[PDB]
Amino acid sequence: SITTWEILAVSMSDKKGICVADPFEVTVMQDFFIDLRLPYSVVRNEQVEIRAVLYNYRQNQELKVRVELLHNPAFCSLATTKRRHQQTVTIPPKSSLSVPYVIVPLKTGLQEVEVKAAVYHHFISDGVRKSLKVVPEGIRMNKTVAVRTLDPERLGREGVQKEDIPPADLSDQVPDTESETRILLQGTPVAQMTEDAVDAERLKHLIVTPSGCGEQNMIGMTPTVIAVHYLDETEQWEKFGLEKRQGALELIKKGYTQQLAFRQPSSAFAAFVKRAPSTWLTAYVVKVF
Amino acid sequence: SPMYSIITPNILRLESEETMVLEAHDAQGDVPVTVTVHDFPGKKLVLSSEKTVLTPATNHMGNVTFTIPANREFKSEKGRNKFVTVQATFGTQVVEKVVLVSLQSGYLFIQTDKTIYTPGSTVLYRIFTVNHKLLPVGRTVMVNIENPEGIPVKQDSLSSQNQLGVLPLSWDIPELVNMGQWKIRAYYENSPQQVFSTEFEVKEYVLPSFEVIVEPTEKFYYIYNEKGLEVTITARFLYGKKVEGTAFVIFGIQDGEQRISLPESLKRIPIEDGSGEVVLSRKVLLDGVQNPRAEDLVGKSLYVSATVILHSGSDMVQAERSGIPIVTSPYQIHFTKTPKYFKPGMPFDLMVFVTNPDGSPAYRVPVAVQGEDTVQSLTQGDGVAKLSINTHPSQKPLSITVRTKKQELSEAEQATRTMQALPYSTVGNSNNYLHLSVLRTELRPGETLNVNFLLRMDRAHEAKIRYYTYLIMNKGRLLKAGRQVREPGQDLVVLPLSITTDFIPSFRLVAYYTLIGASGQREVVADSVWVDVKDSCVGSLVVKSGQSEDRQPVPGQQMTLKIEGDHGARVVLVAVDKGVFVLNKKNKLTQSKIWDVVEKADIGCTPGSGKDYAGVFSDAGLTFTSSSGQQTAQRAELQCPQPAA
Amino acid sequence: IPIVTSPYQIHFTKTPKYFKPGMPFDLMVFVTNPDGSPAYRVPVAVQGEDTVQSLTQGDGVAKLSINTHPSQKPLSITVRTKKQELSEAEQATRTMQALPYSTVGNSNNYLHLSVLRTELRPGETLNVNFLLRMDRAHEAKIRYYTYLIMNKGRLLKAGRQVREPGQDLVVLPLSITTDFIPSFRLVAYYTLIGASGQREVVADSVWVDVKDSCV
Amino acid sequence: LAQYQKDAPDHQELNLDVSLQLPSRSSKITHRIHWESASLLRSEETKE
Ligand SMILES: *[C@@H]1O[C@H](CO)[C@@H](O[C@@H]2O[C@H](CO)[C@@H](O)[C@H](O)[C@H]2NC(C)=O)[C@H](O)[C@H]1NC(C)=O
Ligand SMILES: *[C@@H]1O[C@H](CO)[C@@H](O[C@@H]2O[C@H](CO)[C@@H](O)[C@H](O)[C@H]2NC(C)=O)[C@H](O)[C@H]1NC(C)=O
Ligand SMILES: *[C@@H]1O[C@H](CO)[C@@H](O[C@@H]2O[C@H](CO)[C@@H](O)[C@H](O)[C@H]2NC(C)=O)[C@H](O)[C@H]1NC(C)=O
C-alpha cells in the first residue's frame, strides 16, 4: 500500500511503568503507480464502473502509459484471452489521470480483479490486484421470532416449565445465505419490601456512660450496647459519625469491666455483692452479653 | 507527656501498597510501636504484621508499609461504603482511627489495531494491566464486548501473571452484524465495580487516498466581528502531496446536543495548491437565525461540514470541524489552581489558569488584579499566571478579581473572573501561622525545587518550634516524608527537593509543626500547596528510522526500524494506515490521556491550604490522629465535593 | 585540550562571599567543563551530608542553600560533585570561606533578599522577597523597604514596597523586560531610629542574570 | 428494628435453572439466574 503509515508503540517496564511513545510516521511511495478504487461491495450481474487512478509525479516529464485490464473468468468485459482491453493514455507532469472501465460481476463471493500498466521509453510499471465482495440482491432483515415470560412456578405448575421456539418461516430468505438465531435471556430484578429505618438524628443521645451499682451499671450500659448494633445493621455511621463507634467501644468495654465487679462467686449478679443474687438481673446480663 | 501521631491517606485501596507514617512529638527515649489492622465494623482481624521503634536518633520517625488483600469476604459488598480501622500501639498508649476504603485495585488500558472495522474482518486488541503505580500487575481480568444497544456477545477471563501485564487477544467480526458503535468493557476480578471501557466503530467502508483539514483562523467566533468566521481549507494526499479539486462547505449552529443547519451558508470553492478558503459573514449568520439579537448567540457553538471531491472525480472525503464557540472574550480565566484559603496578615499567592475558549491553554496573555493596575503578569507555557497580594489581618473574606490586559483588544473582549477567599482559622485565634512558598515553573525530572518554610508566632514560643514535619502526596499515596530541623531565630528555612519520575504528574506538599502554647494547650498548624509536573513518560521510548537516506521507501522494501528505550522493557507495536484515522481519529490512546485518568482518580480536592490544620490534610487527602486528641475531619465519600460553578 | 584529573572545573566566581548569621544563605556555584564551557546535569553536593545535592542547570550554575546559625564565625564552604560511576578521585571540588554580615554596632538587625534562580526571559514576572530580621520591639518602625535597580552602569528602576506590622516577609512582583538584559543588581534598604535614639541604616543587594537574546 | 434489618426481607428469590436443547444437540446450554445475575444479559448465537 502506498500511504503514510502511523506506527504506534507502547512500552511496558517493570521499573519504569507503561509508556506510550509518540506515533512514528513512515511514508511509502512510488513515483508512478495505480490506485484501483473499488466499492466495498457490488450487486451480482449488474454493470458497474470501476475507477483506476494513475499518478505521475515528475516535475517536467509527461508519460505515455500503456494501461491494461486483464481477463477475468468472474467478470465480463472486453478483455478476453485472445482480445485484451488495453488503452494508451498520457499523464501530464505533477498530475493524476483516471481511466474508467466497465465490468459485470458473474458469481458471488470475494472475487478477484487485476489491472496492469506500463509506460513507454521508461521501464517503470505497476500492477494492482484487489478483491471486492459480489453481493446478491436483497437486504438485511432483523425480525423477531417470539418474546415471552418465563415463570416455572406460574407456568407449567409445580416449579417446572417447558416451552418450544418454532423456527422462523421467512419465505423471503435469499437462497444459500447465512441466517442467525439470536437468543437472549434476562432476569427480572425485584426489589423493595423494606420499610424505612430511623434516621439516627435523635438517636445520638443514647451514648450513656455506665455507672453506679450492678443494676445501675446495666442501666447505663443498656442503651449504648444496642445502639451500636442497630447502627451497624442500618449502616448509618456515615450520618452518625465514624469516630463515635470507637468511643462507644470504650464505654461498652468499660461497662463490661465494671459489671464483673458485682459478680457473685457462684457466677450470679446483684446490685451489691452483699445483696442476695437476682435471678432476673442474672438473666438480663446474659441477654445483654 | 509526648504526643504520638499516625499519618495515613484519606482512602485506602485494595491490592496495593499503602504507606503508614508513625511519629512521636517531643518524645524522650525509645518507644516501641506495634501495628495492627482490624475490620470495621466488628473484629475478625485482617492484618497483624509489622512493628517499629520510634527513636530520638531518627527524630521519633518511622515509616512502615502494609497491603490490603482481597478475598470473597472483602469483595462481598460492592455497592455501598465499607471501612477498615487501623490501630497503632505506641508503647502502652494506643492510637486508632477509622479509614475509608476504595474498592478500586488498579487501571486497565485497551488498545486496538484500528479505530473502525469492516464486517467479516479481524479485531486485534491488547490489554495492559497495571496497578495504581502504573507498574505491570498480574491479575485476572474480565473482558466483554457489547453490541450498539449493550448486548454482550463475547466474553473472556484470563490471568496476565507471568506475561508482564500484557494480554494479547483477538476476535473475528461476523458478516451478520449491526453497524454502529461497539464497546469493549473490562474490569479486574477483585474489583468488579470499577469498569473500564473503550469504543470502536463498525462500518462498510473503503479507505480514502487523501485527507481534508478544515482550519479556522481562530478556534472561536467573536460576535461583533464584521468580517465573520474565516475557515481555511487544507487538503493533501495520504503520502503528503497537494490535492487539486473542488469543495462544498456548509455551516451550522450547535445548541447543546441539538444541531441546527444553516442552508444558505453553503459555498462552492475550488481547492488549488492543496488549500482553499471560505468565509461565513456576520450578516449571513444573523440572516440564518430568526433571532436578530446578537447577545443570544453568545454561549452557543458553531460547526463546519466540508465535502471535497478530486478533479479526477474518483474519490471523496467528508471532514468536520465543530464546537467553535460564540463568545464575547477570546480567553477564559480560572482560579482552579488558586487556593481558596488565605493566611490573614501574610502574603498570599495567586495561580490563575487562563485558557482559550475551546479549553486549550492560552500563551503569554497579560492578566492583572482588578485592585491596583500595577500588578500584572504574563501567563506561562501551561496557561498559569503568577500573582500575589499583601494581605491585611482581616478575618473577613477577601474578594479577588483578575482581568486580562491584552493590548488592542477592547474591554468587552477582556476575560475576567471573580471569587472570594476564606481566612485561615488558628487554634483559639492564636494568630500563629505557617506559610509555604514555592517556585512556579514547568518542573522536569532532574531539577531541584527549593521549598520555603516561613514561621509566624510570638517569639515566646519560637524557641519551642525545633522542627517541621513534611510529607509528599502523589497519585493517592505517600511518596516521601520527613523532618526539617530548625534552630532558634531561623523563622525561614529552605529545603531543596529533587524531582524524579515518581512525582509525575502532580504532587502535594504538606507540612506542619506542633507545640504546647496559649495557656498550656496543644496546637497544630499546617499548610499545603499543590504542584504540577510536566507530562512525560516515566522512562523514554523513541521510534525512528534506521536508515539515514533513501527518502520515501518503496512498497515492500526492507527498512530498519530503530527503537531506543529503557533496558528490560517489553515493547508492543502496531502500524496503521493514516487513512483509518482520517475516517476516525477518536479514542486514540496517548500518554497524556493516561496521566489524565490518573488525575481523575486523585483523592485530593484542593490546590493546598485550608480552613485549619485539619482542613489542610483533609483537602490534601490525608488522615491525621494523635494521642492528645487532635485529628482530621471525618470523610465518608470517595468523590470530591462539587464546586458551585 | 586540557590534561586534568577531573572532567569538571568548579568556580565560586558567581557565588556571594558574605552570609547572614542566623539566616538562610544561597550559593550560586559555577561548574564548567575543562575548556570553559558550562557543564550540564552534573550533581554537586555540600561537604556536609551527602543527601544535599543538586543538578547543574542549563547555564552551568548549580543551586544550593544552607540555613546558617547565628554564628558570628566565618563559615567554611566546600562543594563537591557526586556524579555516578565516576570515582571520588575524579570528582572536582572547590573550597572557600564566607564572611558574616556586620550590622550597625552589631545590633543584630538584618535585611535578607532571596530571588529565584532560573533562565530568566524578558516578558515573565519575578517575585522578589524581602525579609526583615530584628527584635520585634522595633519591628513596628519598619513600614517600607526602598529598592533600586542597577543595569549597565545606570539606575533603571526604583520604588518603595510598603510593609505592615507583623509581616516580616513581603513579596514584590517584578516584570522582566528587554531593558534588564544582560544582568542587573537589586539593592534594598530600610531605616529607623533605635537604641537610645540613634539612626540605623541596614542594606542588602543581590545579582541577577538574564538569558542571552536581542533587545 | 435491627432484626427487621440485618437479614432484611427482600423481594428477590431467584433460583432459576434454565437449559436449552439445541438442534445440533452435542450439548445442552444451561445457565443459572441468581441475585448477582438478576439483570445480567445472556446471549447466544447460532449460524442457522
Ligand atoms: C435492525 O437492526 C438495527 C441496526 O441495524 C437496529 O435498529 C437500530 O436501533 C438503534 C437504537 O439503538 C438506532 O440508533 C438505529 O438507527 C437503528 N437502526 C435502523 C433503524 O436501521 C435493530 O436491531 C433493528 N431495527 C429495525 C428497525 O429493524
Ligand atoms: C521508609 O523506610 C524505608 C526502609 O525500607 C526507606 O527505604 C530506604 O531509604 C534509605 C534512605 O532513603 C535508602 O538508602 C535505602 O536504600 C532504602 N531501602 C531500600 C531497601 O532501598 C525509606 O526511605 C523510608 N521512607 C521515609 C519517607 O522515611
Ligand atoms: C522617574 O520619573 C519618570 C518621569 O519621566 C517616570 O517615568 C514615567 O513612569 C510612569 C509610570 O507610571 C509612566 O506612565 C510614564 O510614561 C513615564 N514617563 C515617561 C516620560 O514615559 C519613572 O517611572 C520614574 N521612576 C524611575 C525609577 O525612573
Author numbering:
A (entry chain B): 776 to 1064
B (entry chain A): 1 to 645
C (entry chain G): 324 to 538
D (entry chain B): 1257 to 1304
Excerpt from the publication:
The point of convergence is the cleavage of the 186 kDa complement component 3 (C3) generating the C3b fragment (178 kDa) which becomes covalently associated with the activator surface. The C3bBb complex is the AP C3 convertase, which catalyzes further C3 cleavage. In contrast, properdin (FP) is a direct positive regulator of the AP and stabilizes the convertase by associating with C3b in the convertase and proconvertase, reviewed. FP oligomerizes prior to secretion, and in plasma it is found in a mass distribution with roughly 25% tetramers, 50% trimers and 25% dimers.
